[PDB]
Design a protein around this ligand. Structure first.
Ligand SMILES: *[C@@H]1O[C@H](CO)[C@@H](O[C@@H]2O[C@H](CO)[C@@H](O)[C@H](O)[C@H]2NC(C)=O)[C@H](O)[C@H]1NC(C)=O
Ligand SMILES: *[C@@H]1O[C@H](CO)[C@@H](O[C@@H]2O[C@H](CO)[C@@H](O)[C@H](O)[C@H]2NC(C)=O)[C@H](O)[C@H]1NC(C)=O
Ligand SMILES: *[C@@H]1O[C@H](CO)[C@@H](O[C@@H]2O[C@H](CO)[C@@H](O)[C@H](O)[C@H]2NC(C)=O)[C@H](O)[C@H]1NC(C)=O
Ligand SMILES: *[C@@H]1O[C@H](CO)[C@@H](O)[C@H](O)[C@H]1NC(C)=O
Ligand SMILES: *[C@@H]1O[C@H](CO)[C@@H](O)[C@H](O)[C@H]1NC(C)=O
Ligand SMILES: *[C@@H]1O[C@H](CO)[C@@H](O)[C@H](O)[C@H]1NC(C)=O
Ligand SMILES: *[C@@H]1O[C@H](CO)[C@@H](O)[C@H](O)[C@H]1NC(C)=O
Ligand SMILES: *[C@@H]1O[C@H](CO)[C@@H](O)[C@H](O)[C@H]1NC(C)=O
Ligand SMILES: *[C@@H]1O[C@H](CO)[C@@H](O)[C@H](O)[C@H]1NC(C)=O
Lengths: 237, 246, 198, 50
C-alpha cells in the first residue's frame, strides 16, 4: 500500500482489491519460467562471454602450429636435426611470431575487460537503485510505474525481475481548469475536475474515483475573470 | 575518354591517394582515363537449415548489369533469388537501407520488402476533453546483465620455448615484455573478482525468512530457495543454471 | 573505390529516423508522459503545463493567471534557437569530429600502401615483370609484414573509437528515456534550472 | 601470405562486430515507441507555437 502511495494511488485502492492484485502477481510470476524456457535466445548475453573466451583460447592454441617462414614448427625436430650455429635463424622467427600472438591476445583481453567492467558497474547501480528502494526514473527498473524488484544469480551474471503497474480501460471525460462560484475561482487540491455529462466531480490521477466537490479538497486563490475556460457550478460546504 | 587538360609535357596523372588515373597514348597524343574494374563482396541469405535449403545471394554495391526473380536493384547492391513485394512487415533479416528479407508461405519462398516502423495511431486531441483509466494490471519483466568473465594466466617460457634452454636464452635478449603481460593478466583477474564483490556484497547481514510462508496471499515459492534440493537454489535459478552450458 | 575497402549503408534511413522523431513529438505533445508507461491518454496542453509546474513546486493558479506571458516567452525562446545555432561557428563540432576522424584514418590507410619497407619497389607488378620466383619472396615478405602491421593498427584504432561511440550512444539513450518521456528531478541532467520538458 | 596464419579472420570478426554494434546503437536510441502517433490537423495548443 505504501508503494502504491509512492506512485500516486491512494491506499484504499489496494485495501479494496487485495485478492485481485495477489492473483495477478501470482500469474505473472508463474508465466516467467515458461517465458524464459520457450525463448531460444533469452540468455545469449551470458553465452557470448563463454563463446568469446573459448574462441580466443582456441585461436591462441592453434597459432602454435605456424612456421613463420622456418623449416619446421617443432623445436625438438630442429634441435635433433641441427647444431647451435644454424638453429638461431630458425628460432628467431618462431619467437617473434609467438610474441606477436601473445601481445594481440593480451590487447583483446584488456579491451573485453573494459566493457565487462562497464556492464558490472551498471548492474551494481541497478541493484542499488531498484532492489533496495523505489525508483522514479523512467524506464530504469522496467516498463511502467516501478513497484519493486527481485534479484537472481546466473552463471557469470545477474537477472532482475521488475514488478510494474500499468493502467487500462480508460474512458472519455469532460474537464475544466477551474470552477466559478460566488464570483470566486476554485482549483483542485490534488486531482482533476470531471463531468459525466450532467454533474461535476473531482477525481484522482490514475484511478477513476469521483468525489463531491467541497471546500475541503479545493482552494480559492483568485478571481473568476482571469482564468480561460472556467466553468461555473455550485460548491458545497 | 578524358576531359583532362594535359600541358604539352606531362605523361601520367595522379590523385590525392597517389595512384595513376590518366595516361596518354604514345602513338597518338590523346588523354585517356583509367578506372578500376568492378569488385565487391558476396553475402548469403538463408533461413535455418531445419526449415529449408533455399538461399539468396547479395552482391554488395554492384549494378545488376555487370553480374526469374534474380534481378532486383537495391541501394545495398544486387539481390538474386528473392521476390519483392509492396507489403510491409516487421524486419526479419536485415539487408540494406530499409530492406529486409523473410521466408514466407505466400508456396514457401524468400521475399524482400520494406520494413515497417509500427502501427499507425492517432489520438483525438481536444482542449475540453480528457481520458481517465478505470482499471489496472500488474506486470513482471526480466533483465539479464553480465558481471564477470574467466580468469586466465599464461607462462612465456613454456608457451614460446617449452623446455629449450637455447630458446630461452635467445628470448632473454628481447627484454621484459612478459612482466607487462603478467601484470596485465593479474590486474584483469583482480578486477574480475572485484566486479562480483561490488555487485553482490551489498548487505553485511544474513537475513532469513520466517518458517511460516504467509504474506497476505502472495506466492514467493518460485524465487525462494528450495531446501529439498542439495544446492539450495530456487527453481528459476535451476532453470537459469541448466540453460547456460558450455 | 580504394583497394578492398568498402563502406556499408546503415539499416535505417534518415526518413525513418525523422518519422520516429515526429511520432515521439506528437506523442509528447498530445498525451504528455502517459504514452511512455502505457496507453496514450488525451489531455489539454495548458492543463499538462500546469501539472508540470505543480511538479516543480508551483501552484496551478500561477500558470492559469499568466498563460499568455508564458506562451510568448516560449515562442521567443524557440525562435532564438535557429539564430543561435546558425551564428555559432563551432556549434556542431562533435558531429564533424567523427567524419573527420574516419576520413583521416581511411586516407592514412590508403597512403600507407606507397611505402617500400626496405624493398626495391612498392609495386608488385614491377617486381613480377622484372624478376623470377626465387628472388621475389625476399622483396614480397617485407611488404606483407608492413601492410599487416598497418591493418592491425587500423583495426585497433577503430575498436578504441567504437568503445567511446557506444558510451556516448548509451548516454544519449538514457537522456532520451528520462528527459523526453518524463519529468526529471536530477539536477543539471536535462538542462540548467528546473526541468519542464524536452 | 597464407603461411602467416588467420589474422584476417580476426580482422573480419572485429569489423563485423563493429558494424553490428553501430546499427544496434541507433536501434536502441531511436526505436523507443512501438506506435506511430500523428498530430491533429488543427494546430492550436492554447497559444503555443510548435
Ligand atoms: C479489472 O481487470 C481484471 C482483469 O481482467 C478484471 O478481473 C476479471 O474480471 C472478469 C469479469 O468478471 C472475470 O471474468 C475474471 O475472472 C477476472 N479475473 C480475475 C483474475 O479475477 C476485473 O474485473 C476488472 N475490474 C473492473 C472494475 O472492470
Ligand atoms: C505457490 O505456488 C506454487 C507454484 O504453483 C504452489 O505449488 C503447487 O501446489 C499445488 C498444490 O499443492 C501442486 O499441485 C503443484 O504441483 C505445486 N507446484 C509446484 C511447482 O510445486 C503452491 O501451492 C503455492 N502456495 C500456496 C500457499 O498455495
Ligand atoms: C508560429 O510561428 C511561425 C514562425 O514565426 C509563424 O510563421 C510566420 O507567420 C507570419 C505571419 O503569417 C509570416 O509573416 C512569417 O513569414 C512566418 N514565418 C515563417 C518562418 O514561416 C506562424 O504564423 C506562427 N503561428 C501562428 C498561429 O501565429
Ligand atoms: C475518447 O474519445 C475519443 C474521441 O471520440 C475516442 O476516439 C476514444 O475511443 C475515447 N476513449 C475510449 C476509451 O473510448
Ligand atoms: C452523473 O452523476 C450524477 C451524480 O450521481 C447522476 O445523478 C447522473 O445521473 C450522472 N449522469 C449520467 C449520464 O450517468
Ligand atoms: C455562469 O455561466 C453561464 C454560462 O457561461 C453564464 O451565462 C452565467 O453568466 C454565469 N454566471 C454568472 C453569475 O456570471
Ligand atoms: C546500372 O546501369 C544502367 C545502365 O544504363 C543505369 O541506367 C543504371 O542507373 C545503373 N544502376 C546504378 C545503381 O548505377
Ligand atoms: C507497391 O504497392 C502500392 C500499392 O498500390 C503501389 O502503388 C506501389 O507503387 C508499389 N510499388 C512498386 C511496385 O514499386
Ligand atoms: C480550442 O478552443 C478554441 C477556443 O478558442 C476553439 O475554437 C477550438 O475549437 C478548440 N479546439 C478544438 C479541437 O475544438
Amino acid at each position: 500500500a505504501y508503494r502504491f502511495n509512492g506512485i500516486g494511488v491512494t491506499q484504499n485502492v489496494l485495501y479494496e482489491n487485495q485478492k485481485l492484485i495477489a492473483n495477478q502477481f501470482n500469474s505473472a510470476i508463474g508465466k516467467i519460467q515458461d517465458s524464459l524456457s520457450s525463448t531460444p535466445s533469452a540468455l545469449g548475453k551470458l553465452q557470448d562471454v563463454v563463446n568469446h573466451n573459448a574462441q580466443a583460447l582456441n585461436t591462441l592454441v592453434k597459432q602454435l602450429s605456424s612456421k613463420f617462414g622456418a623449416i619446421s614448427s617443432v623445436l625438438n625436430d630442429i634441435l635433433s636435426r641441427l647444431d647451435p650455429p644454424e638453429a638461431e635463424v630458425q628460432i628467431d622467427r618462431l619467437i617473434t611470431g609467438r610474441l606477436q600472438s601473445l601481445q594481440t591476445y593480451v590487447t583483446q583481453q584488456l579491451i573485453r575487460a573494459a566493457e565487462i567492467r562497464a556492464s558490472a558497474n551498471l548492474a551494481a547501480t541497478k541493484m542499488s537503485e531498484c532492489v533496495l528502494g523505489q525508483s522514479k526514473r523512467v524506464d530504469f527498473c522496467g516498463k511502467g510505474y516501478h513497484l519493486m524488484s527481485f534479484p537472481q544469480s546466473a552463471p557469470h551474471g545477474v537477472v532482475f525481475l521488475h514488478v510494474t503497474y500499468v493502467p487500462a480501460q480508460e474512458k472519455n471525460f469532460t474537464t475544466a481548469p477551474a470552477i466559478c462560484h460566488d464570483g470566486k475561482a476554485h482549483f483542485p487540491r490534488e486531482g482533476v475536475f470531471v463531468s459525466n455529462g450532467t454533474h461535476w466531480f473531482v477525481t484522482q490521477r490514475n484511478f477513476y474515483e469521483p468525489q463531491i466537490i467541497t471546500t475541503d479538497n479545493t482552494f480559492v486563490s483568485g478571481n473568476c475573470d482571469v482564468v480561460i475556460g472556467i466553468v461555473n457550478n455550485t460548491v458545497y460546504d | 575518354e578524358s576531359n583532362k587538360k594535359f600541358l604539352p609535357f606531362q605523361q601520367f596523372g595522379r590523385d590525392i591517394a597517389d595512384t595513376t588515373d590518366a595516361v596518354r597514348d604514345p602513338q597518338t597524343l590523346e588523354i585517356l582515363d583509367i578506372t578500376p574494374c568492378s569488385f565487391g563482396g558476396v553475402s548469403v541469405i538463408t533461413p535455418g537449415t531445419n526449415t529449408s535449403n533455399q538461399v539468396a545471394v547479395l552482391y554488395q554495391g554492384v549494378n545488376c548489369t555487370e553480374v526469374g526473380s534474380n534481378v532486383f536493384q537495391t541501394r545495398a547492391g544486387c539481390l538474386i533469388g528473392a521476390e519483392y513485394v509492396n507489403n510491409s512487415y516487421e524486419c526479419d533479416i536485415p539487408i540494406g537501407a530499409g530492406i529486409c528479407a523473410s521466408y514466407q508461405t505466400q508456396s514457401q519462398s524468400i521475399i524482400a520488402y520494406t520494413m515497417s516502423l509500427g502501427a499507425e495511431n492517432s489520438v483525438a486531441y481536444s482542449n475540453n476533453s480528457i481520458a481517465i483509466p478505470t482499471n489496472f494490471t500488474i506486470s513482471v519483466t526480466t533483465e539479464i546483465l553480465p558481471v564477470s568473465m574467466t580468469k586466465t594466466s599464461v607462462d612465456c617460457t613454456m608457451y614460446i620455448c617449452g623446455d629449450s634452454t637455447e630458446c630461452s636464452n635467445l628470448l632473454l635478449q628481447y627484454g621484459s615484455f612478459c612482466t607487462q603481460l603478467k601484470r596485465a593478466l593479474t590486474g584483469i583477474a583482480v578486477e574480475q573478482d572485484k566486479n562480483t564483490q561490488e555487485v553482490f556484497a551489498q548487505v553485511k547481514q544474513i537475513y532469513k525468512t520466517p518458517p511460516i510462508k504467509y504474506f497476505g496471499g502472495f506466492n514467493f515459492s518460485q524465487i525462494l530457495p528450495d531446501p529439498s534440493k542439495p544446492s539450495k537454489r530456487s527453481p528459476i535459478e535451476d532453470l537459469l543454471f541448466n540453460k547456460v552450458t558450455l | 573505390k580504394f583497394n578492398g575497402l568498402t563502406v556499408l549503408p546503415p539499416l535505417l534511413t534518415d526518413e525513418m529516423i525523422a518519422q520516429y522523431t515526429s511520432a515521439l513529438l506528437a506523442g509528447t505533445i498530445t498525451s504528455g508522459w502517459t504514452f511512455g508507461a502505457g496507453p496514450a491518454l488525451q489531455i489539454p496542453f495548458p492543463m499538462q503545463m500546469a501539472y508540470r509546474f505543480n511538479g516543480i513546486g508551483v501552484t496551478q493558479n500561477v500558470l492559469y493567471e499568466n498563460q499568455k506571458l508564458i506562451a510568448n516567452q516560449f515562442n521567443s525562446a524557440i525562435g532564438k534557437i535557429q539564430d543561435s545555432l546558425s551564428s555559432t561557428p563551432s556549434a556542431l563540432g562533435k558531429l564533424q569530429d567523427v567524419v573527420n576522424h574516419n576520413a583521416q584514418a581511411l586516407n592514412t590507410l590508403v597512403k600507407q600502401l606507397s611505402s617500400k619497407f626496405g624493398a626495391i619497389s612498392s609495386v608488385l607488378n614491377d617486381i613480377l615483370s622484372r624478376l623470377d620466383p626465387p628472388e621475389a619472396e625476399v622483396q614480397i615478405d617485407r611488404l606483407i609484414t608492413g601492410r599487416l602491421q598497418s591493418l592491425q593498427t587500423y583495426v585497433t584504432q577503430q575498436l578504441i573509437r567504437a568503445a567511446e561511440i557506444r558510451a556516448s550512444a548509451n548516454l544519449a539513450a538514457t537522456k532520451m528515456s528520462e528527459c523526453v518521456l518524463g519529468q526529471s528531478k536530477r539536477v543539471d541532467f536535462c538542462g540548467k534550472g528546473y526541468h519542464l520538458m524536452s
